[PDB]
Amino acid sequence: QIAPGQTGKIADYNYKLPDDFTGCVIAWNSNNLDSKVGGNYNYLYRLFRKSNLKPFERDISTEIYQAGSTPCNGVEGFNCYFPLQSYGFQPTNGVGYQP
Amino acid sequence: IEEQAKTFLDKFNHEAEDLFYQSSLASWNYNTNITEENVQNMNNAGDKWSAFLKEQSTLAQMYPLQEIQNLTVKLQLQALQQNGSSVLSEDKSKRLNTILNTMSTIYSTGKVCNPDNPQECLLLEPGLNEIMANSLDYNERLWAWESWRSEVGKQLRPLYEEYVVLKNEMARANHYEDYGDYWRGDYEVNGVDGYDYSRGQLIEDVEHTFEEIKPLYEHLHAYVRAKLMNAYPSYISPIGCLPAHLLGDMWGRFWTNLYSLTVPFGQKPNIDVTDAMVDQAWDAQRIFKEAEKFFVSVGLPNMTQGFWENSMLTDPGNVQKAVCHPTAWDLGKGDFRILMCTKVTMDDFLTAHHEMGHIQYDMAYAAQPFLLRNGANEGFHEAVGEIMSLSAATPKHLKSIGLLSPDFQEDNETEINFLLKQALTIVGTLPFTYMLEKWRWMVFKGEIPKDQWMKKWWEMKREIVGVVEPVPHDETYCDPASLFHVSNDYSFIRYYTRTLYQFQFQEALCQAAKHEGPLHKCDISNSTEAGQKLFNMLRLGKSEPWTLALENVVGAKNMNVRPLLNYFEPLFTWLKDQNKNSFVGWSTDWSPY
Numbered sequence: 001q002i003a004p005g006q007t008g009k010i011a012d013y014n015y016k017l018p019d020d021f022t023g024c025v026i027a028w029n030s031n032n033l034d035s036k037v038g039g040n041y042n043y044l045y046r047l048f049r050k051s052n053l054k055p056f057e058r059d060i061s062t063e064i065y066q067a068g069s070t071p072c073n074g075v076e077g078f079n080c081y082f083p084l085q086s087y088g089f090q091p092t093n094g095v096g097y098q099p
Numbered sequence: 100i101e102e103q104a105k106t107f108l109d110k111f112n113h114e115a116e117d118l119f120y121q122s123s124l125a126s127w128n129y130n131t132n133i134t135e136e137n138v139q140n141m142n143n144a145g146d147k148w149s150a151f152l153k154e155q156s157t158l159a160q161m162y163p164l165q166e167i168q169n170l171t172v173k174l175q176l177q178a179l180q181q182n183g184s185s186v187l188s189e190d191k192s193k194r195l196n197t198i199l200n201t202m203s204t205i206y207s208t209g210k211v212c213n214p215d216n217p218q219e220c221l222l223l224e225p226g227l228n229e230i231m232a233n234s235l236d237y238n239e240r241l242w243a244w245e246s247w248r249s250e251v252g253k254q255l256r257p258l259y260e261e262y263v264v265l266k267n268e269m270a271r272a273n274h275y276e277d278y279g280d281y282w283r284g285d286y287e288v289n290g291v292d293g294y295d296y297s298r299g300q301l302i303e304d305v306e307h308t309f310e311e312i313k314p315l316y317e318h319l320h321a322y323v324r325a326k327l328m329n330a331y332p333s334y335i336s337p338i339g340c341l342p343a344h345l346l347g348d349m350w351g352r353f354w355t356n357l358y359s360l361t362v363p364f365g366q367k368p369n370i371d372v373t374d375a376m377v378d379q380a381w382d383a384q385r386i387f388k389e390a391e392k393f394f395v396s397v398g399l400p401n402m403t404q405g406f407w408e409n410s411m412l413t414d415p416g417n418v419q420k421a422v423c424h425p426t427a428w429d430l431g432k433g434d435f436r437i438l439m440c441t442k443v444t445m446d447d448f449l450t451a452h453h454e455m456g457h458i459q460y461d462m463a464y465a466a467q468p469f470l471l472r473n474g475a476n477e478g479f480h481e482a483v484g485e486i487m488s489l490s491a492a493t494p495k496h497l498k499s500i501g502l503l504s505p506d507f508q509e510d511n512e513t514e515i516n517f518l519l520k521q522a523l524t525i526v527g528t529l530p531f532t533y534m535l536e537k538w539r540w541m542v543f544k545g546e547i548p549k550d551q552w553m554k555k556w557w558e559m560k561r562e563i564v565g566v567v568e569p570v571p572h573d574e575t576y577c578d579p580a581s582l583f584h585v586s587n588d589y590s591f592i593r594y595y596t597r598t599l600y601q602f603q604f605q606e607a608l609c610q611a612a613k614h615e616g617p618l619h620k621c622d623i624s625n626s627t628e629a630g631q632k633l634f635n636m637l638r639l640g641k642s643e644p645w646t647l648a649l650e651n652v653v654g655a656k657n658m659n660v661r662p663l664l665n666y667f668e669p670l671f672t673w674l675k676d677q678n679k680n681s682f683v684g685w686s687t688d689w690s691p692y
């Protein structure tokens with residue numbers, strides 16, 4: 001999902017690059033430090049957000065989502081969710097679910 | 100409105116794939132290193148997973164199912180909004196679980212005592228099944244056979260009579276007319292532009308296909324009877340129904356233990372390569388690497404790497420307490436593994452292909468949403484395993500993998516020993532598998548009342564199977580309930596449907612493989628087209644119906660039994676010659692007493 005031209009849950013709501021991006025992307029497998037058997041829930045991610053990002057919006061803003069027409073003041077019962085989730089990284093994960 | 104349900108299910112997937120993971124990991128860790136601390140730790144993980152899934156079911160009910168335009172988000176809501184249990188009064192929910200736990204303990208703990216020696220008593224598996232698998236004493240077998248029913252079956256009868264009420268209240272409260280139709284619900288398909296299928300339509304397609312099997316079965320029955328008359332002289336009529344205590348286990352479910360009594364050409368040794376594996380010094384790693392070479396040879400992906408370290412193929416070097424029962428494990432997070440304790444054998448070389456063929460299915464639909472990561476119906480999931488073992492059992496595979504010599508020759512007499520050994524497993528059970536489901540479908544709807552439960556059963560054993568009570572029975576017995584699948588509440592119709600689909604898949608891949616011979620010689624190797632037609636069905640999971648997945652592989656929108664019969668035409672042609680002077684089929688009026 002991490003490129004110019006690419007789409008997905010990260011590429012809409014977490015990390016956009018301009019479609020003519022002046023630069024490069026580098027990545028390496030980190031099972032051997034980012035993951036432990038208890039579930040390293042340390043890393044979070046924006047699973048829900050209204051509208052869409054622009055490129056390079058590190059929008060730390062954290063309030064409850066709400067879809068369609070409902071008010072929501074916390075509680076997050078139905079049609080409204082807390083916007084972040086943890087990654088469940090563990091050293092026993094398969095390759096595509098590794099950190 | 101619909102788009103809220105997409106976001107609600109996105110929450111569910113990212114929550115569930117992790118709860119499911121550490122739950123199923125604790126289950127794995129218990130199974131491979133058994134301690135009461137591990138029992139507690141896996142149980143309260145399974146508990147906290149269950150507690151999440153039922154909360155999410157009452158939150159999924161909030162969504163109108165009829166407003167959903169998308170079919171995929173609709174399957175995910177329908178599978179989560181299901182009520183299943185709960186619909187009962189909670190004291191009737193508690194009573195149902197109390198009865199199920201009571202039928203489960205009575206079946207498993209059930210002792211049969213020797214009347215010659217009342218101080219010696221046998222559980223079901225040790226000693227009591229062993230007489231039915233290996234004794235040739237008609238009276239010792241008849242003693243084990245009727246003692247199981249008269250000592251244990253009579254305790255399950257009075258429980259079954261209350262379980263059938265509680266199951267049907269639950270099915271009705273879920274708006275199905277009976278709990279037999281609740282089970283059928285798996286096969287239901289709607290709204291998919293000509294690919295639809297009714298719960299009831301299974302019963303008609305079973306009964307339409309089964310009578311194409313009856314001609315093959317009636318000659319196999321006559322041949323088995325003509326051989327059993329030499330093992331049991333005077334005890335069997337040449338036109339009789341077969342006495343149930345003679346059929347190789349406690350119920351007659353498979354005829355495969357009769358191979359040594361029924362054999363066509365036993366002086367020709369039916370092939371083995373276990374001797375070749377030990378003389379080539381293979382181990383658990385080689386056994387699975389030559390199995391992996393078969394799936395990459397057909398063009399499928401290899402092991403998910405971490406598989407090799409996180410799987411257990413062997414019983415440990417530490418004297419570890421573990422369940423060595425062979426099982427393909429999926430635990431989510433792409434974490435596929437295989438628990439077994441292999442010993443260097445061709446049976447294990449072929450179980451390695453069978454169980455790896457489960458992992459190879461799971462991996463294809465790993466890209467589907469979590470609620471859709473299962474087989475297209477409950478039958479497909481073993482059938483996609485077995486077609487790999489069918490490939491690997493061939494002498495063409497075994498001579499390409501070095502387990503048979505280049506100068507090894509196949510003679511006709513070896514082929515007929517093989518096909519008869521197969522038919523006693525593949526075909527001999529199909530009357531039992533249709534009939535036990537027919538009896539439960541008739542019991543849950545009340546077409547058989549409780550003053551006919553045992554009366555009807557033995558009329559059906561006699562009419563559908565050609566198999567007869569060694570001793571008279573009455574409504575104080577429950578011979579159906581004397582079985583795991585009936586006492587532990589498990590729907591059996593998945594075995595009939597899976598045994599049909601298996602040969603459709605086989606013959607479709609045989610045509611792709613340009614196969615020049617009979618269907619049983621066929622090897623899934625070096626073939627490319629076969630792998631492409633296979634993978635394009637494997638990667639669909641539940642997202643598309645089984646009725647569409649069939650026309651992807653086979654070209655047909657429903658189940659067809661011709662391919663199974665076309666595995667056996669060389670054998671059926673032989674059985675006909677072996678029956679010319681004999682009587683074929685049976686008299687329902689005959690009884691052994």
Ligand SMILES: *[C@@H]1O[C@H](CO)[C@@H](O[C@@H]2O[C@H](CO)[C@@H](O)[C@H](O)[C@H]2NC(C)=O)[C@H](O)[C@H]1NC(C)=O
Binds near residue numbers: 105170172
């Ligand atoms: C609802 O149906 C549409 C199509 O009928 C699905 O849309 C596709 O979604 C994937 C991403 O999941 C895209 O890559 C495709 O390009 C989309 N195609 C079309 C034609 O829309 C959509 O996924 C379905 N909803 C869900 C929840 O699966």
Ligand SMILES: *[C@@H]1O[C@H](CO)[C@@H](O[C@@H]2O[C@H](CO)[C@@H](O)[C@H](O)[C@H]2NC(C)=O)[C@H](O)[C@H]1NC(C)=O
Binds near residue numbers: 160180186273
């Ligand atoms: C599930 O069981 C409930 C009864 O516990 C059925 O009735 C629902 O009752 C709840 C309140 O507890 C309402 O919110 C629902 O509207 C009722 N059902 C609906 C959605 O009409 C309910 O019908 C059952 N659901 C299924 C799967 O049929």
Ligand SMILES: *[C@@H]1O[C@H](CO)[C@@H](O[C@@H]2O[C@H](CO)[C@@H](O)[C@H](O)[C@H]2NC(C)=O)[C@H](O)[C@H]1NC(C)=O
Binds near residue numbers: 515
């Ligand atoms: C296996 O093949 C052999 C070779 O054809 C069969 O032997 C023939 O059997 C018929 C019927 O008895 C005879 O008319 C032929 O003369 C036999 N051939 C020879 C060369 O003697 C044998 O019957 C086959 N066995 C099975 C089980 O099909």
Ligand SMILES: *[C@@H]1O[C@H](CO)[C@@H](O[C@@H]2O[C@H](CO)[C@@H](O)[C@H](O)[C@H]2NC(C)=O)[C@H](O)[C@H]1NC(C)=O
Binds near residue numbers: 396
């Ligand atoms: C089926 O696949 C195997 C595996 O690639 C092929 O085996 C090769 O056979 C050639 C000549 O027979 C040998 O020189 C190679 O060393 C073999 N490869 C391996 C890895 O052992 C086999 O030829 C294929 N069958 C057909 C008909 O093409």
